[PDB]
Amino acid sequence: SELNRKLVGYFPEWAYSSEAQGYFNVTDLQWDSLTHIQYSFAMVDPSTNKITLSNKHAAIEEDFSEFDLNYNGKKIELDPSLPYKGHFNVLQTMKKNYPDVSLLISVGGWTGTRCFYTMIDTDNRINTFADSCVDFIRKYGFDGVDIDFEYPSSTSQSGNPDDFDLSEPRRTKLNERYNILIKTLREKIDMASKEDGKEYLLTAAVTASPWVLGGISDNTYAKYLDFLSIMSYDYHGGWNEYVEHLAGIYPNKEDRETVTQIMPTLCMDWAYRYYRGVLPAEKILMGIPYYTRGWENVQGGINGLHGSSKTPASGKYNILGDDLNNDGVLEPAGANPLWHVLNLMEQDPNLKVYWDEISKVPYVWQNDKKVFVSFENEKSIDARLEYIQNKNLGGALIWVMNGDYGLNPNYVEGSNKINEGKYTFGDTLTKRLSQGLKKMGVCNKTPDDLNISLEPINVDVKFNGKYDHPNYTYSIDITNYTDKEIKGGWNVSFDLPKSAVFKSSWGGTYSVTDNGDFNTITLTSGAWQNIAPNSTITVQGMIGLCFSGIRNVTFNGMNPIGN
Template sequence: MLLAGLPATASQAAGQESCRPDGLYQTPGADVPYCSVYDSAGREKMGADHPRRVIGYFTGWRTGKDGKPAYLASDIPWDKITHINYAFAHVDGGNRLSVGSDGEKNAATGMTWPGVAGAEMDPDLPYKGHFNLLNKFKKQHPDVKTMISVGGWAETGGYFADDGSRVDSGGFYSMATNADGSVNRAGIDTFADSAVDFVRKYGFNGVDIDYEYPTTMKDAGNPLDWSFANGRRAGLVKGYAALMKTLREKLDRAGAADGRHYLLSVAAPSSGYLLRGMETFQVQKYLDYVNIMSYDLHGAWNEYVGPNASLFDDGKDAELAAAGVYGSAQYGGIGYLNTDWAYHYFRGSMPAGRINIGLPYYTRGHKNVQGGTDGLWGKAAASACPAGSGLTKCGDGAVGIDNLWHDLDTNGKESPAGSNPMWHAKNLEKGIVGDYVTDYGFPADTKLTGTYARKYDATLVAPWLWNAEKKVFLSTEDEQSVGAKADYVADRGIGGAMIWELAGDYGWNAAKGQYEMGDTLTSLMYDTFKSAAPYGAKKSNA
């Protein structure tokens, strides 16, 4: 490894070049210490038992301070994963990377958890909160890398102020692209410089950009962002490319000075609809790897009932059939709402080993489903559509006990989405009302209506729960589907898998007789990957 502050010799630079991943952009004039992260074949060094990536998103808001179950750094299965993406930082009003004002209520840098085993602060660090704990545990697990993830659905075009209100600042949209569609060079430089300062200050190994979405497709992304995103659509792709190039170069120059290679990744959409509007972008070369968001492929934003994250297409997708995709020469009759399609889309421009497929540890679902087979490929249209529901009829999303992890709309009301952690879905499947329901506002004597029967489609590689009495469909993941997806990754030389989010995994609490937060699915992936061959490191690999 190069010593910080010392220039590399010609022989050292040549040695570092042997570790650069195939196709990764070379920053002019920067002697990047690639070998601090990659081996001589250009494969990431993650520990002897981790030939593939297991990337888990760790969210900052499950602190337990609101009375709901907490998920802290001490709950992460550190020995089973390779990377932790902290979600989320945001772009502030001055175009800088930020997690908000310092203070004891700041979960990232100021909060503490007195009396919670494993949540004791490292006194040697000048900050507290999640960042303190992440660095404390990283000392015990030095092969695990941490990334600061910026953006997300709610904070791509704005951010949450200290009082919890959303500031519609423009976020990524205005930071990277001016109102006239031109590239905002000054905004990008400010953000990239602040990103370098941030990873140095808080001990991160790199930056993950979750920009949803730099596409030309009108009304894509969060409806709260449309007012300033739609007018910039024609220039978003150029701004995105300039942002990623600048980040790569500034991280590389910082890495050359610090004697360590800083990672850069993105969370990329997997939907063919969104990617149509991003077809001219060329950012893969700036990335160490791409995390495909191969989930949210069906949900209550429209009436079509289908799996959240199927691995394959079955030629029967009701949404695609209604759009004429299967008979369209443009798409070659190929369904594009599945993980396999998304993987091959990105595989055309980068090695398999620099691609990670996405796995959701949460459900999506509808109620009042009509038709289909046990709900699959049926329809569930809502009687009235809220703003931002999309181009088709909005869906009748599941609510109540079938929507434990729901968001709130702008009026503070439950957004119907059928969103649940997998541990709650497992309890529904078994007819169990967990004792945690009171934490989410349900009475202690809550009773379930109907039976949640598990169904599975082997062609799609997709499980779901079907409540025939309530006509509720909840798309799930479990050992069978995750095992098949892990095999898919291992067999094709893919880099690994990305999880949204770690807190959704499940484990059985025998003493309580219920499923709770655990690591069953993550452990299954680890067990599959640890005996896998090294991932494909060349673009030319089959």
């Protein structure tokens, strides 16, 4: 069951009352196609350090009397035997007909990370928080917890700027404290599973940004997750001038933002390689967007792509723009659900779709207004399915379920109103993903690292280092716990994820051997580097770019098992 493909979708609790979000509610979820639903969002309470609802009314109070609850054709009523209403009642009611769809509570997000920073400060607060997550999933009938901390990184000025007053003083410890948080959550959730006779999950949606990842020194937390979802989107957008893809799959040497870097990093496949240092592919999900970002008055490029713009797209090209002063004026971002872009194309024959065969995503270009918007369509879904099969990925995580498309019951020919176009939300791309995940079958089990099958040696190999972008300076400490000197000329090897490039060994000699998602690095010492019994020797060198961890460490062709 753990090797089954996963199709996980985010449910936005705010959508049901919002025109731009299509008034999407729980009965509009793609229940026949999703395997898991992530409810967005819970957060951490500032005073109690417990999990808390963000919109309590939506989650547990709303009766939907002013909204339409129906699935397929059948009216859906709230279950009156439950002690809560809201989206959570509808979720439980639907799950009775879809008992194998797993429900996860997502905690955090871009605007819900703030109180994580203080909660992680002490072990007793982490314990209180983890206990409260167990209480919450029991109370509201959830199957697990998804942690969306943006971001547990030492990178200065990462995460939401509104939280710098909390994150900046904590940068040096955030990664260590996050690792304790995830481990403690796993411990408490596994105990609850045993007590309740139910298999609860713990997952995380994690950064794909090399800038953020340069400040992440320990990815051990990943081993405690049922799956790790890479947020392989938001690679590009109106925060800078580079008119480039939101969510490319493959590395693109023409991405102008990274054209001088060691390799192109702003694509799913780079993050896949990064995370292979700590996880097998079958525990990694691809992030897929059902939203866009974009620019207007684009200069240069070809059909906008690889051009430049200091003006993110606005107006009818930005219906999901943020309203930060709550005045109706939206911040330009070129942000739309997919169905709205389809409706714009129905109205404008000069808003045209193009395909990038390198990145394997589509984009939309208006050649008169010079508007470029990212896009996602059947062709990119098919390319993503091919990637999932080729890489043995666990599946996909979708932000966000009201952005898929289908035909609109409220269509009015000739109307420009947001919810009167040919299309509204639907299940077209999600069903296509589900069908493809069914067709390819279950994941394979990735074999264990080969080192554990080798003969053991009582040598400890400890890999550490420091990252100063783009350079990782490593230090390997080798301790001889045998009773005989180890002569110089010994070798150590390790597998380095292909998110990074080995550059130099500072002493001795080295070789680099292709090994799948890794390069095997073999460091051969000089004859003078003898290791006395109970002694430690250190070697250093440099690697370009970052990686989640190293694997498959060997020493003199044996498995170094320490003391």
